[PDB]
């Protein structure tokens, strides 16, 4: 390590900015999903029974939202394509990148002012927030969108930021649960797509899988489009449980407990 | 670890929170400091020049905040003591947590809304916000603060949070400059403290170091109160440069250029 007091005693490294590479492995934190595709081949669709008015409210937000989206996206009118898959999935990660961020931060500030230990919830919500971004940079590559969709993103994030921000204030049981179902709805989408290839109801023409994604998911150089999905969907299922476990931890007043999943990924 | 479809497919993990241990490592990301004590020994006090109004103004805004906070915290009143110091820093780290955070959280939303690579900023600031939050997490473990101080912290937090937030949106350079110029003082103060220990005016009793500190900073189980202030001094010296470096890039219409520390920390 050549990181020390000489470098710390400097005023700037603006000097050095025109001689440092744009390496696509510096995009993310050194904190990557490590899957294996035979195994994540068998991620299944699930569903969690709603307990109270909150899990119910959550569920209705998330079904009502879908219906509307499916109709304003025109998505289930006529056949499928690769346009509409990528489009839905690009738009939607813009919104997906947020919750974990407004939650991640809230736990941060909440720690700081009460000077209480966070027992590991923050980073997970932060490294989610990154993940779902990373899906969006990946989807950036396969298809760039016209102004129309670039706008809808802005005005939507504007809205979805705020809502989340104040829901996560009031009942971050509402919000951790609300995510839970959004991941359940997604982990469908991404199977239905993995089952579309299989058969031949859709022709992947991006069997050059983006560089960004290759380094991010550590896929071998000959990965297909399906191979992308399967690792996105696995990540999407990780949150499905994690934000349901978190919504459950709230239900029974365990917001101050240790985030199980820091141990459940390192283990004995 | 064993983290595959079978966990992903099991619905919640509420069941397991009574059986997960509370391991001090897990409080923080794995993305920690890694100093060498005699290297960091020669962390030195530096003062970068203001360029424009923005730089000069941000620099006044720190010196006014130091003049205020010192007199009003009675700090300027005779002899250095161990406890008025831990009180000092404890407070300061509860704010030092915030701007690293709003920084990541604002660049992140931009990334998702304009669909663009971040190129390694988001994560470098987010660890800064964690590093300070960890300083805190150590400091609190040296002294519990009283309600009059628990109360000042919770008021501060909002006034700052919403300061940093509107000032970020407005002018990130101003912030980064402001934080550069804040963290200069961070270095002044912690150096001087070690100038009290090496010497005599301070003869501290907390020469146990809390275990949040030792796993986070990788120190021996026989590290001193000097040593701990010295890595913190290091940590703060890291933060000092980066934010002056960031503001500078922002000054030189270079916002979206790769963050140049993702190499200067990594290059093998
Ligand atoms: C809160 C606190 C104060 C101290 O002096 C010391 C420690 C703590 C503390 O809990 O440490 C912070 C731990 C990190 C998480 C931040 C939690 C602090 C805010 C919530 C504490 C109250 C318990 C949740 C009641 P919230 C709730 C949400 C989910 C599950 C259960 C309860 C609620 C319920 C019914 C009616 C109205 C509100 C709620 C209210 C306010 C903000 C967020 N959520
Ligand atoms: Fe997603
Ligand atoms: Fe998702
Ligand atoms: O998704
Ligand atoms: O600080």
Numbering used by the authors:
A (entry chain A), B (entry chain B): 31 to 298
Any passages from the paper?
The glucose-dependent respiration of bloodstream forms of the parasite Trypanosoma brucei depends on an unusual and essential mitochondrial electron-transport system, consisting of glycerol-3-phosphate dehydrogenase and the trypanosome alternative oxidase (TAO). Clarkson et al. first demonstrated that the respiratory pathway of the T. brucei bloodstream trypomastigotes is solely dependent on a “plant-like alternative oxidase” now known as the trypanosome alternative oxidase (TAO), which is located in the inner mitochondrial membrane of the parasite. The active site of TAO is mapped by the presence of di-iron and a hydroxo ion. The cavity has been described to be a ubiquinol substrate binding site and the oxygen trough.
The crystal structure revealed that each crystal lattice was formed by two dimers (chains A–D) of TAO related by a noncrystallographic 2-fold axis and 1 was bound only in chain A. The molecular interactions utilized in maintaining 1 at the binding site included π-stacking interactions involving rings of the benzoic acid head and neighboring tyrosine (Y144) of TAO, extensive hydrogen bonds, including with T146 and N286, and electrostatic interactions. Of note, strong multiple H-bonds between the pyridine N in the tail portion of 1 (i.e., PDPP cation) with backbone carboxyl groups of V199 and I200 of TAO significantly contributed to stabilizing the binding of 1 to TAO. The binding site for 1 is unique in that it is found far from the active site of TAO, at a distance of approximately 25 Å. Further, 1 was bound at helices 1 and 4 of TAO, which form the membrane anchor of TAO. Figure A shows the active site in the ligand-free form to be in an open conformation, while upon binding of compound 1, the active site of TAO assumes a closed conformation. Superposing the two substructures revealed that the conformational change at the active site was due to the inward flipping of Arg96 side chain into active site cavity 2.
